[PDB]
Amino acid sequence: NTQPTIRKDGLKLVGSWKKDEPELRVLSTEEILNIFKHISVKDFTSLGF
């Protein structure tokens, strides 16, 4: 799955996907929380957590 280009607009994080103008949508806080809860124990330890 192609990753988006993340930018911070105000207090919200907006990601833009490039097509095969690029699509843009707001990443909901719930979506980010769900993704963060799937990171493995070893994965985020390598990130310093």
């Binding site: 799955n1 769900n34 809860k37 799937h38």
Partner: protein
């Protein structure tokens, strides 16, 4: 000439024509089941032509034969639908409130929770889905690319 009046050649009379010819519960039950869509028939035009309908409509509501949408100001029947399901009332309010108290977990985590408790989940975490020289012959040669 009007479509709301019916002519009787037998005696030569003019009678009112109701939108739906219903003067018996059996007729209403069959008429409602014949609807090709879920558009309920209004009570305003049903009360017209049927001297008593609320008594019959309410009677069928108790028997779980039809569905009734009632007003909020005072109990008054409006557009009705056929009850394709079972009994209209089968569960006490002590469980409806409990059903309201229970809050589902995160959708993506629900399938894993059921698998851990034994029950087979009828879904998977959305993290698993994987979105996958010579020109004189020009205009004469057909492209036989494959056989």
């Amino acid at each position: 000439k009007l479509d709301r009046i019916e002519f009787d050649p037998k005696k030569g009379t003019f009678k009112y024509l109701s939108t739906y010819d219903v003067h018996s519960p059996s007729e209403l039950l069959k008429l409602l089941r014949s609807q090709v869509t879920f558009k309920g028939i209004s009570c305003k035009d049903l009360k017209d032509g049927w001297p008593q309908c609320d008594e019959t409509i309410n009677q069928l509501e108790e028997d779980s034969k039809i569905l009734v949408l009632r007003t909020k100001k005072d109990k008054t029947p409006r557009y009705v639908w056929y009850n394709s399901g079972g009994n209209l009332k089968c569960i006490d309010e002590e469980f409806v409130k409990m059903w309201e108290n229970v809050q589902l977990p995160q959708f993506a985590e629900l399938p894993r929770k059921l698998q851990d408790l034994g029950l087979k989940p009828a879904s998977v975490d959305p993290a698993t889905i994987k979105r996958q020289t010579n020109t004189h012959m020009t205009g004469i040669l057909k492209d036989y690319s494959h056989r």
